[PDB]
C-alpha cells in the first residue's frame, strides 16, 4: 500500500549504491531509470558520466529523500522488520566506528575526477572500457584537467586502497575456513561503497595499477567474490557493458 | 510527451513557491501531494509544520531537481517557448540586479525558525492561525533543579534568537516597503500598478507573496503591517490575494478546516 519509489540513472555511481542497498535489504521498490539511450547530441550513457551535479530521489509515503548517502541512511533507519538485513551495526556497538570510518573514507574518493581523468588522459589507464573516440571528442570540444592533479589523486587512491588491503588482511588472519567481508562477518554499507567503487575503477581502467597479478591480492580476492554475490550480479551485472543502453 | 512531475507537500512553504511558479509560467505539471490528511499520531497538517528537513523534487525527462530554489531556476532556464512568461528579466536587463537582490533577500529569511517560534513562543504572535493546543502539545527536588535550570536557559536563548530574527525580518520588510513606495511615486494612481520591481510579476514577487501569506498564518503580520504600519506592503498583500494564479494555487493553504 505504501510504495517505495526511486527515480535514478542506471549508470550513475550514486544510483548503483542505492539500488545495491535496496537489493541487500530485500525491499520491494518501483525503480524509474529516467536516463535515455541517446542524448540530444546522440551521445550514449558512457559519454555522460557526470553530465550534471544531480542526485537520485526516493519517495516513501510522505518522505522525499535526495542523494545516495541520505537515501541509504533513510532506508537503514526506516525498514526495521526483523527479517530485513541491517547493513550498519547499532550506533552504540564498538563496530560502528570501523564501518563508519571505511564508508566515509571510500565515499570521500573523488570518483568524478577519476572518470574525467580516464577520458582526458587514457595513457594513465590500462583496459579502460570506454571507447577511445570518447577521449578524442571531449578533447576536441575543449579545443582541474591537468595530468599533475590526476597523478596526485591516483596516488591518494593508492593510499586508501593500501588501508583497505590491510583491513582485509586482518580479516584473513582472524578467519579459518562463512568468510568475512571488509569489517566483519556481515555485508555492510562499507562493502557496498567498496564493491561499487572497485567495479567503477574496473570500468575506468584503474583496476590493473591497483590490484591483480600479485598486487593487493586480498583486494583482488574481494573484487572477484563481490562479482559472484547474487545481489551484486542481479543489480550491477551489466552496468559496465557499453553494448547495453 | 515529456511529463513534468512534482512530488511535494501542499502546505510546505517551499512547495507553495514552486507551485505558484508553475501556475505563473502556465506549465502543465503532474503534481503529487505526498502529505497524508492524518499522521500516524492522527495529527492534521497544521501540527506538523516542518516535521522534517525534506525538499520537493521535480522530474523532467532525464533531469531530477530537488529544493525550491533549484527547481524554480530549472523551470526559468528550460521553458523558453515564446508564449511562456518569464519571471526573471534577461541577465543583461537593467532590471536583473533589482529582481535578483529582492529574490535573494526574501529567500534568505529563516521561515522554519519563524514557524518553530510561532508554536513555542506564541506570546510573540498576534492572531496566529495555529490553534493554541498545538503549542501545549509540543511543549509537553534532587536533580529537578538542574533540568528546571537547563530548560530555563535554552528557553532564554531561544526567545533571544527569535526576537533577533523578528527584528531582522522588520529590516527586510522596511526595504520592501521603500521599494514599493518608489513604485507608487513612479506610477499614476489610476490604472494598472506595477509589482515589486516593475510592471511584470517576477520571482521576487513569488518569494514576497508566499512569505507574507505564511507570516499571516503564523501571526507575524500585525507587528509588520496594518493599522498605518507599512501601508504599501499591506496594499501589496491585499492585491496578491486577488491575483488569479495565487488564489488558484494558495487560496486555501492557510485554512485549517481543509485537510
Ligand atoms: O492578472 C491576474 O490576476 C492573473 C490572471 C491569470 C492569467 C495570467 C495573467 C498574467 C498577468 C501578469 C502580470 C499582470 C498584473 C495584473 C495586476 C492587476 O491587474 O492587479
Numbering used by the authors:
A (entry chain BBB): 23 to 165, 199 to 232, 235 to 302
B (entry chain AAA): 23 to 162, 184 to 302
Lines from the paper:
GDAP1, a 358-amino-acid mitochondrial outer membrane (MOM) protein regulating the mitochondrial network, is highly expressed in neurons and less in Schwann cells. GDAP1 contains two domains similar to the N- and C-terminal domains of glutathione (GSH) S-transferases (GST) (GST-N and GST-C, respectively), a hydrophobic domain (HD), and a transmembrane domain (TMD). GDAP1 functions in regulating the mitochondrial network by inducing fragmentation of mitochondria without inducing apoptosis. Although the sequence identity is only ∼20%, the GDAP1 core domain shares a fold similar to canonical GST enzymes.
As no GST activity was detected for GDAP1, a metabolite library was screened for GDAP1 binding partners. Through metabolite screening, we identified a ligand for GDAP1, the fatty acid hexadecanedioic acid, which is relevant for mitochondrial membrane permeability and Ca2+ homeostasis. Among ∼300 compounds in a metabolite library, HA showed an effect on GDAP1 stability, increasing its Tm by ∼3 °C. Due to its limited solubility, HA was titrated up to 250 μM, and a concentration-dependent Tm shift was observed. Taken together, DSF, ITC, and BLI all show that HA binds to the GDAP1 core domain and stabilizes its structure. Interestingly, HA binds to GDAP1 in a pocket next to this cluster and forms a hydrogen bond with Arg282. HA binding increases GDAP1 stability by inducing a conformational change of the loop α6-α7, which is involved in the mutation cluster. The HA binding site in the crystal structure of GDAP1 is located close to the CMT-linked residue cluster and the membrane-binding surface. The fatty acid-binding site observed in the GDAP1 crystal structure faces the membrane-binding surface in the context of the modeled full-length dimer, suggesting that the observed ligand could mimic the lipid membrane surface. This, in turn, suggests that membrane binding could affect the conformation of the GDAP1 core domain, for example, via the incorporation of acidic lipid headgroups in the binding site. GDAP1 could be a fatty acid transport protein due to its localization on MAM and MOM and its fatty acid binding shown here.
